[PDB]
Amino acid sequence: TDLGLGHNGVRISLNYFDGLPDPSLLNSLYSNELKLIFKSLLKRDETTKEKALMDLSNLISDFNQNEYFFNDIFLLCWSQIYAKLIISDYKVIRLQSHQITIMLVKSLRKKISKFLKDFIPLILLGTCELDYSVSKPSLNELTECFNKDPAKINALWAVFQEQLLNLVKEIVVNENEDTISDERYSSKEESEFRYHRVIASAVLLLIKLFVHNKDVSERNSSSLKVILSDESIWKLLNLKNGQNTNAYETVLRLIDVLYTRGYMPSHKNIMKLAVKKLLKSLTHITSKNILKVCPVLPSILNLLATLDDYEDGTIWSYDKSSKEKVLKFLSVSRTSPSPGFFNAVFALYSSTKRHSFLDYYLEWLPFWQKSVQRLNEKGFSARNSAEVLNEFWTNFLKFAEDSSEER
């Protein structure tokens, strides 16, 4: 049987309809107080959950009196609902749930070693939550749980890399908008936003896994292929609305790491999947939303310059109208340039000229011309006027020195 995130006989999942504590297992709990606490956590009413978690948290803080209660039956049950609690919209529920688990690890050391495979990956997922109101306190209490040693934390990323990837796979491949949220009690927007948060956390977790493990690609090739071949991660490459750009930038970073490590060159199918979605997202940038998106444009351009190095600009062939997309993307983005922008544009020019992607005089030159025109009319009133203006001229002069052979 597929136990999902579970490694001790019971199924642990993030969805709402399975991986639930068996009614018999619950009745076998030590104290009648626990039975009610758990029955309270299996409901939907989130008000009574905050108290139930508070009560449970109190029983664990007073570990002296209460200890025989926190046995294997408790850990099996808790490990199942813990997974479902950390996807709640109420950040208090997610935070308290993490603290409880962290407290259990810190208190039942050795006695809980068997369950660490189930708890650590979810704790770390909490530290990867883009909301710092949850990810910072979680990481703090976690770091404190291990003698305040950040090296002991970095070890966790290596020890549990298999279970960490399995968690990613569960979020990305197996669950979706309609399994993380019950359509009967949740609107479409609610479901989307909820799933977005969870998968966004998974992408960051996935990135941290490459940071801490130099051989992750080779040691987990089959697991990574399943994760990255799915469409779900790459669907995050969306700048339309309503989400901010945090998740978007995180995927950019993932693509970069994957390319740098030489993973994507090894998996053309996955690279085609990511790039197609990346190129399509360029069309999401308009005058309507340029002011919300402009701080991530240097990242886009730099990534495209990097990818252009693959097989002499082969990535551009993944989209029949990639040239047109880039042109329209450049014309929009020059209206609201930010620091690093012109450095990135030149990076793209310097790389793509090797196969004459865009015309020097009919396409590149007017871009630079209209750019300085924009900078002169508005600035230098705006902030970072001097920095950006100087950045433009430094890069244009380098661009202009190629006008030699292009004549």
Residue 251 to residues 7, 234, 256, 300, 365: CA-CA distances in angstroms?
A: 30, 7, 9, 11, 31
Helices (H) and strands (E) in the chain, counts: 22, 0
In the bound state with K ion, the residue whose beta carbon lies nearer, of 200 and 330, is 200
CB of 91 to K ion, least distance (A): 23
Q: Is the dihedral of CA 248, 231, 214, 303 positive or negative?
A: negative
The neighbour count for residue 154, using CB atoms within 10 Å, is: 14
Q: Nearest approach, Cβ of 197 to K ion (angstroms)?
A: 14
Nearer Cβ to K ion (156/205): 205
Q: Judged by CB, which is closer to K ion: 131, or 230?
A: 230
How far is it, in rounded angstroms, from Cα 254 to Cα 128?
14
Could you give the C-alpha distances from 209 to 164, 196, 278, 287, in angstroms and in order? Answer: 8, 20, 22, 37
State the number of CA atoms in the 13 A half-sphere of 213 facing the CB. Answer: 24
* CA 121/CA 156 separation, integer angstroms: 9
> Concatenated DSSP letters for 85-111?
HTT-S-HHHHHHHHHHHHHHHHHSTTT
Of 226 and 386, which has the nearer Cβ to K ion?
226
Minimum CB–partner distance for residue 170 and K ion (Å) = 10
Residue closer to K ion by CB (options 86, 139) is: 86
Min dist CB 195 to K ion, Å, is 8
Question: With respect to K ion, which residue has the nearer C-beta, 107 or 176?
Answer: 176
Q: Which is nearer to K ion, 34 or 198 (CB)?
A: 198
Distance, CA of 396 to CA of 278 (rounded, Å): 27
**Minimum Å distance from CB 4 to K ion?**
14
Q: By the 8 A CB rule, do 16 and 198 touch?
A: no
Cβ(170)–Cβ(223) below 8 Å: no
Q: Which has the closest alpha carbon to 115: 70, 158, 84?
A: 70
Least Cβ distance, residue 176 to K ion (angstroms): 4
Q: Which is nearer to K ion, 35 or 225 (CB)?
A: 225
CB of 231 to K ion, least distance (A): 8
Q: How far apart are CA 336 and CA 231, in angstroms?
A: 31
From CA 180, how far away is CA 294, in angstroms rounded? 32
- In the bound state, the residue with its beta carbon closest to K ion is 232
Measured from the CB atom, the residue of 15 and 395 that comes closer to K ion is 15
Residues in the site for K ion, rule: CB under 5 A?
176, 232
CA angle 15, 21, 26 (to 5 degrees): 155
Q: Minimum CB separation from K ion for residue 300, in Å? A: 24
> What's the closest the beta carbon of residue 172 comes to K ion, in angstroms?
6
CB of 340 to K ion, least distance (A): 33
The Cα 292–Cα 332 span in angstroms is: 13
Nearer of residues 167 and 285 to K ion, judged by Cβ: 167
Q: Which of 296, 172, 182, 187 is nearest to 228 (CA)?
A: 172
